[PDB]
Amino acid sequence: AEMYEKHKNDKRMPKDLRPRLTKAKRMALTKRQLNMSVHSVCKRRRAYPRMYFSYSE
Amino acid sequence: MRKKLRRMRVKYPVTPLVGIEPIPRPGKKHDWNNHGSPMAKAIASEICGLAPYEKKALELIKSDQERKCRRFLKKRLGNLTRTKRKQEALTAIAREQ
Amino acid sequence: GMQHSAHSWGTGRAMARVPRVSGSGTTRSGQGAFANFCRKGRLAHPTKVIRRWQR
Amino acid sequence: MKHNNTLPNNHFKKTAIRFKTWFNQPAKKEKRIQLRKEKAEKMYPMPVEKLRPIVRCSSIRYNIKQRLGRGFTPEECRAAGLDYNYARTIGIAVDMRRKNMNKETFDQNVERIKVYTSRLTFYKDRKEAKASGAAQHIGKIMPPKKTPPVVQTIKVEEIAQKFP
Amino acid sequence: SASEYLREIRKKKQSDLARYLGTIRNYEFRLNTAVHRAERPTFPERAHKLGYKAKQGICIFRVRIRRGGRKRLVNNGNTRGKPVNAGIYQLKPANSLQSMAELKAGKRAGNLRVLNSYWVGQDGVYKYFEVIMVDPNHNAIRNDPKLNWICKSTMKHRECRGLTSASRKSRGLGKGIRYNHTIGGSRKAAWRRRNTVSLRRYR
Amino acid sequence: KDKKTRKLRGHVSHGHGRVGKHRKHPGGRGKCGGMAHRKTLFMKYHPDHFGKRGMNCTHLKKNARYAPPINVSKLWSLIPKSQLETIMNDNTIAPIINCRSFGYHIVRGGGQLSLKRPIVVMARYFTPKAVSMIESLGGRCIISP
RNA sequence: GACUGCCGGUCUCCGACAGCGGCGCAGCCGCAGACAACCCCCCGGACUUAAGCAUAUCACUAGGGGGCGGAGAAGAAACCAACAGGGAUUCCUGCAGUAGCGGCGAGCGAACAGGGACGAGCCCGCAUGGCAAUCGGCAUCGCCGAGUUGUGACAGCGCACCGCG
RNA sequence: GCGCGAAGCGGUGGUGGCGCCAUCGAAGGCUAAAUACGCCGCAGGACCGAUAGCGCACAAGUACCGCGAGGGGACGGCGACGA
RNA sequence: CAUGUGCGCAGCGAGUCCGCUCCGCGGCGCAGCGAAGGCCAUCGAGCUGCGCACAUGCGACCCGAUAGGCAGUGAACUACGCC
RNA sequence: GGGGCCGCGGCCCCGCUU
Ligand SMILES: [Mg+2]
Ligand SMILES: [Mg+2]
Ligand SMILES: [Mg+2]
Ligand SMILES: [Mg+2]
Ligand SMILES: [Mg+2]
Ligand SMILES: [Mg+2]
Ligand SMILES: [Mg+2]
Ligand SMILES: [Mg+2]
Ligand SMILES: [Mg+2]
Ligand SMILES: [Mg+2]
Ligand SMILES: [Mg+2]
Ligand SMILES: [Mg+2]
Ligand SMILES: [Mg+2]
Ligand SMILES: [Mg+2]
Ligand SMILES: [Mg+2]
Ligand SMILES: [Mg+2]
Ligand SMILES: [Mg+2]
Ligand SMILES: [Mg+2]
Ligand SMILES: [Mg+2]
Ligand SMILES: [Mg+2]
Ligand SMILES: [Mg+2]
Ligand SMILES: [Mg+2]
Ligand SMILES: [Mg+2]
Ligand SMILES: [Mg+2]
Ligand SMILES: [Mg+2]
Ligand SMILES: [Mg+2]
Ligand SMILES: [Mg+2]
């Protein structure tokens, strides 16, 4: 508890105080990084957004 | 009766599309008849000149041996269509000289 | 029943030609293996799940 | 082998031959129904199927019949009045490699988009959409109806007129 | 554009220019070790077509591979088998020589991920390749949306599983009639599907 | 009934003889020996097994070569049952039978037409008796696509 | 707070280094080793079948080497077709024990369709020149670095979830 | 693999060459889902019921043997656990 | 188990087959002949299931070789060489 | 044996070195 509030707002926290997920899960890309797309994919999703509609015959 | 059914074959009468123009497919855009930068091909041909087999095929063309040049370029390139077009690309070199 | 390194000892040893369990020092050693008539042997024509269960 | 029989073509000579049993077949069906229901509940107003074109089948065996195609060409979507990238945002499938071959398949699919977009009600966002109370369409959107072919009839005095 | 002038010069590989630079590059690559880290792409335009950026965390490793086929490694030709399997000396490897270069660059820089590789020279003895290798731990790559796919865990040792451009060519993949050997993802995927008997419940 | 094994319990040499036996593979495996020791089996029951006949077609296409024939007898059976009664009871009305719509490509001339009235038939090919039978009754043989 | 349950702490030593590699790098990181059912890459038998046997077969298997992941691989046509044309991959059905290969012997042997499951599409490179608009690191709003041998782009997530019958 | 080595148009058309016509755009990259699967967890079963069923219902990969790689068993039952 | 054939039984029958799937114009049959070009009947009950016998491939009724291969482990016995 | 193995010079031969 003491060492957490010492190195809470640290650039690199000690390894003790980071959550021990899994070596694979610590090395995973973040959800921000996975959502990163190029400019053409941004403009296309922006100019043609998701539509909410219902069909009936 | 394969040939007879092929000969007696009647196409279904269908109406061709006369009006529309093609939308250019994204990622599939080429002008295949004017492909590269033609200034860039001219510059690199000025710098690099010709290949050694291209120089030998000029010497066959300039010595009135275009028959042997055709056999030589077909053996080099391996394709007859590129062989024909390489020879007329090379006779244009021999004519301007 | 097939989890042994069993081999026939051959003739000449006054014992039947059935595969015997290899090794020594245990009671299983030298005993018959692999055969349907053997104790702890594989049953001949073992039952399969590829049997046609439905009709 | 012994008697008169068809010559055996049984290919179990390889000891590497596997067997794919189907004991999961009733269980996969109930899993497949559950996922389809959960897909319909994830997209509540939107239909679970895309709108797909009517294309003719390829060879001479099958060109008598039409089936449901993969997607509309962008020239079909433009003639219907839509950008094909907009057409994908509503439930229309778009095929960039199908070629606009003839006027009959073209005009049928252009009408098929126009009928579809006329039949749509739009909503502002997802919360407006889920609270609509609109019944969503289950199954293929405007499928080609399979029918036995009706026998056309002409009068016998008209036979020499039509077919000399 | 500049990329066009670099490309048309690169295509002329039998120039007086290219035979000169072929001679001194092949000299310089042969003085270094088998796999050694290059400073920059020899052909930057060719590397840019294969995905190289001038970013931190993208590296160029240079690998040479001895040319020719690969003989069968037995004692004295004794293959201990049928005479159809007794061949030694005109055998060819199933994977490319360029794919061997990615295997050597991949094993050397175990932290990096092999992106692609390209031919930089050859002589009678060696073929020289530069291998584009990407650092999946550098933040310039992980924040890059064109390239952070290689930071995923499914891209560990792409060259060891046949997933780079050079190593994928040996697999027989492709579309259509000529590539029926690999319908299903690979040769083993197609062989597996063709050699199961499908025993349904009601048969 | 039960299997044969349930009756052969008790008898030595289950059903395969004392002097003979049930050995593993006497004669060889499969259909081997078709020219040596099972030649009598192949001279008798499969005399066309060995050898080559005819011109090989590398990749024969089934859908391109699809041309199933229909005899001219069964042409009236293609009319659907509901629609057939208004055609049989109308004599000035002739039916137009697109055989491709019913999956038939060739019309051969086997048997007689079901009714002696004109029918207009569309197919890919008609045999000469199929033309002669249909066009004698006042109908038409039309080569349809 | 007995006996329990759930989760967390502590968690000796041997065993992953002659280490290898990335980033200007006061330093921060990664690789190694395990797993071996599934999957991908390479190497690759012989028994066996052919009533012998050498090609063939077994089998592009077993086995060995390497490498991942929760699946993998594949994948948005330099495809199929020859029609009135279809339209990524994968899987099922089916084509089909067929066309074909084969001491044309033993044997081996696919594909397009049609029907279906499922469905999804995208991107780098030749990006401004009235100014790299981009990124990494830090002791941080300022340096240092990368970079003109050319850098450059955000749509998806999260919580709650009984105690009696 | 080696030799040769392209093009502005090229590839292909069950695959000799050439020509037609037709159809696609390789040699750069990513991509869910349907698909496969052991350990393990869970639930079942016309399964086996202690020589069976996993090698093991038991202090089982144990005892034990082999220089070593490895090999590998046997063995279940009182009662109201109150006497 | 797969695929056949024959017989018996069963349902329907110029048709027949639920069980891939959320829905087979898929197979076979209603007619063959030829290598093919081409010819096309004077003509014919089948399809599917269940059961048995039998053939074949599979470990193939059970048990059995000498062999061959692939991958490993041993110079504590013993052979030689070195320190 | 032929080819590939990218060097200069001079008369297949002779120098040269890179
Ligand atoms: Mg047992
Ligand atoms: Mg650098
Ligand atoms: Mg061998
Ligand atoms: Mg006997
Ligand atoms: Mg008998
Ligand atoms: Mg006898
Ligand atoms: Mg003889
Ligand atoms: Mg490892
Ligand atoms: Mg065997
Ligand atoms: Mg043999
Ligand atoms: Mg034998
Ligand atoms: Mg022998
Ligand atoms: Mg993992
Ligand atoms: Mg993948
Ligand atoms: Mg084979
Ligand atoms: Mg850029
Ligand atoms: Mg109660
Ligand atoms: Mg063309
Ligand atoms: Mg063809
Ligand atoms: Mg591509
Ligand atoms: Mg007992
Ligand atoms: Mg036991
Ligand atoms: Mg001993
Ligand atoms: Mg049998
Ligand atoms: Mg044995
Ligand atoms: Mg041998
Ligand atoms: Mg060995």
Short mmCIF file of C-alpha atoms (C1' of nucleotides) and ligand atoms in Angstrom, two decimals, chain G residues 32-35 67-68, ligand 8:
data_model
loop_
_atom_site.label_atom_id
_atom_site.label_comp_id
_atom_site.label_asym_id
_atom_site.label_seq_id
_atom_site.Cartn_x
_atom_site.Cartn_y
_atom_site.Cartn_z
"C1'" A G 32 16.01 -17.88 -25.21
"C1'" G G 33 12.91 -22.30 -21.84
"C1'" A G 34 8.04 -25.05 -21.47
"C1'" C G 35 3.77 -26.81 -24.17
"C1'" G G 67 7.22 -22.09 -35.06
"C1'" C G 68 2.46 -20.01 -33.31
MG MG K 8 11.11 -21.90 -28.05
#
